[PDB]
Design a binder for this molecule. Sequence first.
Ligand SMILES: Nc1nc(OCC2CCCCC2)c2nc[nH]c2n1
Lengths: 258, 297
Amino acid sequence: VPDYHEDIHTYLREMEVKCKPKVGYMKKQPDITNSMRAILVDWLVEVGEEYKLQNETLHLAVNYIDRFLSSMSVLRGKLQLVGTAAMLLASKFEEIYPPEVAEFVYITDDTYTKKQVLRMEHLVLKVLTFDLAAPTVNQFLTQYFLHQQPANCKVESLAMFLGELSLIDADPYLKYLPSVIAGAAFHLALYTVTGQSWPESLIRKTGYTLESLKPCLMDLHQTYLKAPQHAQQSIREKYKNSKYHGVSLLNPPETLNL
Amino acid sequence: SMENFQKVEKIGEGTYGVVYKARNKLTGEVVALKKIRLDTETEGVPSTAIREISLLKELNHPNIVKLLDVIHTENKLYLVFEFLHQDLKKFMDASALTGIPLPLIKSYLFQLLQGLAFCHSHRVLHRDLKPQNLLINTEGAIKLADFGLARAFGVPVRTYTHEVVTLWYRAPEILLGCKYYSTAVDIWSLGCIFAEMVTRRALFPGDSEIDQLFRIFRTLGTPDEVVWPGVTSMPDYKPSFPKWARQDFSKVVPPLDEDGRSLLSQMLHYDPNKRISAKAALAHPFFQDVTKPVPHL
Ligand SMILES: Nc1nc(OCC2CCCCC2)c2nc[nH]c2n1
């Protein structure tokens, strides 16, 4: 119904390509790795839950961290300071009531000072040149959900769970744009919950067919199937809640017949 | 960091910080500098500056003010903007006995809608449209400025800050407590400005929230279920509201032709789902002969 929704999706299709992190930055960091990043992200999911932050704020904070790490080498010991300043900035952009800085110092377990967090806030803003308005998988997903008549709330929670699982693993998801991940997640949740398939109105809206989503969907199907074995588990724990209709208790499809 | 700027005058306080007129001592450029004192033990960069800088960098458009630089000291934050001849407020007070000619009015309005539709198509709500935040140059352009209360909205929207829009320009869905609001609130603010240009005074110079509502009810009729399904169930709607009849627009805005009255009525519909969008408003017959006169300054 919403006026501007098509213009906005077209504009988001153009900004996700400009706001995208550099795909092999991790091979050039000298001290941090993909498994450290994964742990930071899993910690930010719990911080988001403790403070009742929107999921969008989580998705933004990750976008900021990956861009910051695209051009700044960071030691493993300051990696939480990057993360904390990013969640702080994503909260200020996106939340009606952002937790205050002392709240953020505190959840660091006092690892850092307020003065460090505020100076890391200024450096992140300088490296990202204040470009905080980025497109995230959450934003694509909430637009695609406008096409699934009547809305199915389990489909919606499960697509969000899968799109949040993609934030943990830079390898392979830093390869795909948010709109394509959102596409693969929506197909896989719809499929798992009702057996229905990426809709023809989404095909006309995005230009994406089931064949162009394939590469991303094979990865995400494997991520979903192996979720139980992954070292990071706060996402699965978050999505068992009734607010998310317990979708992380559902069984993944063993195959997708593609 | 500010050594190359010379202070010319203090212009005023806007959404946040202090705004000054200043000049670049090397190039001569006259700019507007918005100063924000930060400290440190406090909160870092406030959310209004983060939004205003980030969103104005996504808004390059002839009717939107230019942000030229950001100088982020340890102590203070300066936003450096192009300087225009003046704001629409001093111009409206810099026409109150004579009145801004109609062609100028229509030109400014057509421009403010092209600016606003650009904002909305880039998912930005302004949320503080009023004459002091609109800047005109000496060639006939007008621009949206002061994005300190702006925000990026989502598709579909969620709940946003309730304390938004300066009270005279504030739409009835915020005044009545609707959980959600979206692009329609900016359009309501522009219909209030269009009418103020034409008749020479604020349309709804409410003092308080209840005063602002009852001023909109007396001119436009107390909304009921025929014009706005669900108004009678809104959070702050009261069945004991007085029931006023709607006024003819030949009395609300006498100088307007009927193309003007119809577009002003489409911008002030009560139901945000019936209020005209900025983009649909650009196709209105009122603008069929729009031209671009030069203000008299
Ligand atoms: N001429 C002018 N005035 C401004 O601010 C108006 C005042 C009005 C009252 C509130 C503070 C700002 C500007 N901002 C950017 N360019 C500007 N140019």
